[PDB]
Amino acid sequence: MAIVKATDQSFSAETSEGVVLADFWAPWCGPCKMIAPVLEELDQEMGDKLKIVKIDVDENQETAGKYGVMSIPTLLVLKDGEVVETSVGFKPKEALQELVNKHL
Numbered sequence: 001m002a003i004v005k006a007t008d009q010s011f012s013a014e015t016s017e018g019v020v021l022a023d024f025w026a027p028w029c030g031p032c033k034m035i036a037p038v039l040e041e042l043d044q045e046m047g048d049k050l051k052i053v054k055i056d057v058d059e060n061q062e063t064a065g066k067y068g069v070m071s072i073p074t075l076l077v078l079k080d081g082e083v084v085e086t087s088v089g090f091k092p093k094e095a096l097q098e099l100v101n102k103h104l
Contacts (some may be wrong), residue, residue, distance in 0.1 A: 003043050003052045008063040011055055016081035019050040019104060024064055024074040026057050031090045032073040041093050042100060049104055077103055 006014045006022075014020065023039055025032040043052050057064050057072055064070060067083060077085035077100070084103060091099070 001043065001047045003039065003047070003054055005054050007055065007059045011053065011060060011063050012081075014051065014053050015078040017051065018080065020053060020078045021050055021100060022053045022055055022076040022078065024055055024057055024060075024069050024072055024076065026072050029072045035073050035075075035090050038091065038093050038096055042096060045097060046100055046104070050100060079103065 004014060011022070015022065021039075021042070023032075023035070027033070039052055042050075055063070057070065061070075064074075067076060067086065069076075069086075071088065073089065075085075075087045075091070075096075076083055085099070087099065
């Protein structure tokens with residue numbers, strides 16, 4: 001549908017409504033921009049079955065620290081308010097949609 005944005009202020013509310021993938025990112029990191037169209041493919045293919053939330057590590061430094069994240073791109077998967085998976089680096093579409101469909 002459309003990808004969401006959050007910070008420490010609201011990431012906890014956003015992750016507490018369904019299956020929610022998150023992308024801990026920063027714009028100076030090449031791989032964060034390389035995985036962006038792959039996340040848009042997931043938003044087209046599954047972005048109603050799950051939510052996708054962009055979250056920037058400079059802005060949510062505390063919240064990323066809540067999961068020991070201080071490196072990017074770092075994907076998280078949360079479900080009804082709790083983390084259930086974490087992954088780091090770029091991924092191709094097929095692997096990412098396989099990873100997602102396993103936790104729908």
